[PDB]
Design an enzyme around this catalytic site. Structure first.
Site, mmCIF file in Angstrom:
data_model
loop_
_atom_site.group_PDB
_atom_site.id
_atom_site.type_symbol
_atom_site.label_atom_id
_atom_site.label_comp_id
_atom_site.label_asym_id
_atom_site.label_seq_id
_atom_site.Cartn_x
_atom_site.Cartn_y
_atom_site.Cartn_z
ATOM 1 N N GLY A 99 0.830 -1.233 -0.120
ATOM 2 C CA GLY A 99 -0.082 0.000 -0.223
ATOM 3 C C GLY A 99 0.704 1.399 0.177
ATOM 4 O O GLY A 99 1.761 1.436 -0.871
ATOM 5 N N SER A 100 0.399 2.286 0.878
ATOM 6 C CA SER A 100 1.039 3.618 0.919
ATOM 7 C C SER A 100 2.740 3.530 1.297
ATOM 8 O O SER A 100 3.287 4.399 0.890
ATOM 9 C CB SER A 100 0.175 4.356 1.937
ATOM 10 N N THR A 101 2.948 2.464 1.842
ATOM 11 C CA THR A 101 4.392 2.378 2.164
ATOM 12 C C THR A 101 5.248 2.530 1.003
ATOM 13 O O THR A 101 6.589 2.622 0.980
ATOM 14 C CB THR A 101 5.080 1.339 2.960
ATOM 15 N N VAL A 102 4.946 2.128 -0.284
ATOM 16 C CA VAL A 102 5.495 2.109 -1.484
ATOM 17 C C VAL A 102 5.325 3.595 -2.266
ATOM 18 O O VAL A 102 6.060 3.766 -3.220
ATOM 19 C CB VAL A 102 5.543 1.088 -2.408
ATOM 20 N N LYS A 103 4.420 4.509 -1.895
ATOM 21 C CA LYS A 103 4.421 5.805 -2.645
ATOM 22 C C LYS A 103 5.515 6.441 -2.541
ATOM 23 O O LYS A 103 6.049 7.367 -3.659
ATOM 24 C CB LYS A 103 3.435 6.707 -1.835
#
Ligand SMILES: *C(=O)N1C[C@H](NOS(=O)(=O)O)CC[C@H]1C#N
EC number: 3.4.16.4
Length: 475
Positions: free
Chosen positions: A228-232
């Site tokens: 999820g958002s941890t790879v933005k």
């Protein structure tokens, strides 16, 4: 007859004992010789704490076999007393059995041996050849003759693990799980300058000296999830590397939703119109990262994710370690482009996410992962240009200084929370921002999602870890 050799000591990086070969006495018997002294069996069965009928039945039912084990892993004292009975056909083997002085604190990383003193999980298996040494040889009749080959003892192994940082991560993970009603989780800490895994703790855990399958999962290496958002930050790295986006460039994310054909992307924080690139990470806007992804193309995002190792083989050779999956669609339609960009188009492990953040923290250079103490650090691979990485570092610093609950008192920290799917609460980050030293991934398997759960864990483990490593405050 084989002469078992002394298995190598496993220590943490500072020499604390984690796996110790301690001498034991094993008793085997030749049944037919034992059959000539049946009057001695009851006292022998007594001394072994074994039922007389079970004992007698095993001798007789294995009559013509000339080799059976009576008991394994006795104390040298207990074995001495049995041999002192002078029971015909009862013989002793001086062996070694493993004991794990840190027990459940480091169960999954260290692993354990089987009944034959052979590595069967974790480091004990991964480094079995290093640790095993080579058995000696002994020729017999009945009569013992010569030691025709000496046992060569196995070699000592110092892990990368710092038992002090491991215990802190263990205590803080367990408390975070209880506070949230969660039953499973993991916490990884890595040295961004050396590639060393400084702590790798999972819950539930088990005592390797004394079973449930949930407890045996080395979740940091085997629990696979969409990050999820941890790879933005890696999507943003691609955006900055594309040449088309400054950190101050603007994206209109109003009204916090975006329709792509039939699916609707929905931001969690929908009080935004124009956001700059830092603002897209602060608000964690799926709409913003999607719009940027449409502009630069998914290929460039895939490429950064592949280079930092998400969904790729970590190379550790750790047994059972999983790889996840980073699909290479070659050409991505709109929905798959957006889905990759905000981290639901791939599957990773916590080790991988931490390694990826370590490369970002280390100015874009990925230092190879190690589970053993690194004295000579291998050269890293520049996987993100230093300018882009340093820019993404600064953006992630502002994300923390504002997810205020992730602030590390005394230090500038950087990081990004997320909600994983397979739901898990995640935080990935590194500190201190001025010269990063350690990266950390927290994974909490939820039964009040995301940053509110995982960020305080990061804050507290990072606070303790930096002080245990004497990192000078930079704030
Ligand atoms: C990231 O994993 N996201 C985006 C959004 N914010 O994440 S956070 O847990 O607040 O940091 C909501 C959860 C998830 C989605 N979609």
């Amino acid at each position: 007859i084989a002469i078992p050799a002394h298995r190598g000591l496993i220590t943490d990086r500072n020499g604390e004992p984690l796996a110790v070969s301690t001498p034991v006495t094993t008793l085997w018997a030749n049944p037919k010789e034992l059959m000539t002294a049946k009057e001695r069996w009851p006292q022998l069965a007594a001394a072994l704490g074994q039922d007389t009928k079970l004992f007698a039945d095993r001798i007789e039912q294995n009559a013509e076999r000339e080799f059976i084990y009576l008991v394994r892993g006795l104390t040298p004292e207990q074995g001495e007393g049995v041999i002192a009975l002078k029971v015909p056909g009862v013989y002793s083997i001086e062996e070694f059995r493993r004991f794990y002085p840190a027990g459940e604190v480091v169960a999954h990383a260290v692993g354990f041996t089987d009944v034959d003193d052979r590595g069967r999980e974790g480091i004990e298996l991964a480094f079995d050849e290093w640790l095993a040494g080579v058995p000696g040889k002994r020729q017999v009749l009945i009569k013992d003759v010569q030691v025709t080959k000496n046992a060569k003892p196995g070699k000592t192994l110092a892990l990368s693990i710092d038992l002090r940082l491991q215990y802190l991560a263990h205590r803080e993970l367990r408390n975070a799980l209880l506070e949230n009603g969660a039953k499973a989780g993991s916490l990884v800490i890595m040295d961004v300058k050396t590639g060393e895994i400084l702590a790798m703790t999972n819950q539930p855990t088990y005592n390797p000296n004394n079973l449930q399958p949930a407890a045996m999962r080395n979740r940091a290496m085997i629990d696979v999830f969409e990050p999820g958002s941890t790879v933005k930050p890696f999507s943003m790295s691609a955006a900055l590397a594309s040449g088309r986006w400054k950190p101050s460039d603007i994206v209109d994310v109003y009204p916090g939703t975006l329709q792509i054909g039939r699916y609707t992307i929905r931001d969690v924080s929908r009080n935004s119109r124009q956001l700059d690139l830092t603002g897209i990470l602060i608000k964690s806007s799926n709409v913003g990262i999607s719009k940027i992804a449409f502009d630069i193309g998914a290929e460039s995002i895939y490429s950064v994710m592949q280079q930092v190792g998400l969904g790729q083989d970590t190379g550790l050779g750790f047994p059972g370690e999983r790889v996840g999956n980073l699909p290479n669609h070659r050409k991505w339609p709109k929905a798959e482009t957006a889905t990759l960009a905000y981290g639901y188009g791939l599957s990773v492990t916590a080790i991988q996410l931490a390694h990826a953040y370590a490369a970002l923290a280390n100015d874009g250079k990925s230092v190879p992962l190690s589970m053993t103490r690194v004295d000579r650090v291998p050269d890293g691979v520049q996987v993100i240009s230093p300018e882009v990485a340093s820019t993404v570092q600064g953006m992630l610093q502002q994300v923390v200084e504002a997810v205020f609950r992730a602030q590390v008192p005394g230090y500038h920290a950087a990081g990004k929370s997320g909600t994983a799917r397979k739901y898990r609460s995640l935080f990935a980050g590194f500190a201190p921002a001025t010269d990063p030293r350690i990266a950390m991934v927290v994974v909490i398997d939820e039964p009040y999602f995301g940053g509110l759960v995982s960020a305080p864990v990061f804050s507290k483990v990072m606070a303790g870890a930096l002080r245990l490593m004497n990192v000078p405050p930079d704030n």
